[PDB]
Copies of this chain bind each other. A is one copy, B any other.
Amino acid sequence: STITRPIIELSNTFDKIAEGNLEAEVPHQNRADEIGILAKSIERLRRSLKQLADDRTLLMAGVSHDLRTPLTRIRLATEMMSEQDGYLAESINKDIEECNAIIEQFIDYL
């Protein structure tokens, strides 16, 4: 059948996938020639990359809350400290705030 046009369409599509559009539609998947073989392989790569990305992102979504929990616990603990140790309690609170800043300004974006 036709060769150069489907090859170009698959190349353009692949460019879209490679640069991060993992939702790009792969054409020519049903072809009974080598163009079809290529298209199926490209679709498999697309699905592979999408799987990687989704797994990683799901994992990432848990990190902020998972750090925030023990940090919050530290705060609760300082709130129980002896009134003689207001200084230490406050110092620790400032460190906690630094950690939270790292979570909000950076980790939340991962």
- Give the B-binding residues of A (Cβ under 8 A): 1, 3-4, 7-8, 10-12, 14-15, 17-20, 34-35, 37-38, 40-42, 44-45, 47-49, 59, 63, 66-67, 69-71, 73-74, 77-78, 80-82, 84-85, 88, 91-92, 95-96, 98-99, 102-103, 106-107, 110
A77: chain B residues at CB < 8 Å are 88, 91-92, 95
Given A34-B4, A34-B7, is A70 in contact with B98 using a C-beta cutoff of 8 Å?
A: yes
Contact B106 A63 (CB under 8 A): yes
| A77 and B85 alpha carbons, distance in the complex (Å) | 10
**Which residue of B20, B37, B70 contacts A99 across the interface (Cβ within 8 Å)?**
B70
Contact A45 B14 (CB under 8 A): yes
Overall SS of chain A's interface:
helix
Question: What is the CB-to-nearest-CB distance from A59 to chain B, in angstroms, rounded to a whole number?
Answer: 8
Contact A7 B67 (CB under 8 A): no
Question: What is the CB-to-nearest-CB distance from A41 to chain B, in angstroms, rounded to a whole number?
Answer: 4
Given A1-B3, A38-B10, A82-B82, is A18 in contact with B92 using a C-beta cutoff of 8 Å?
A: no
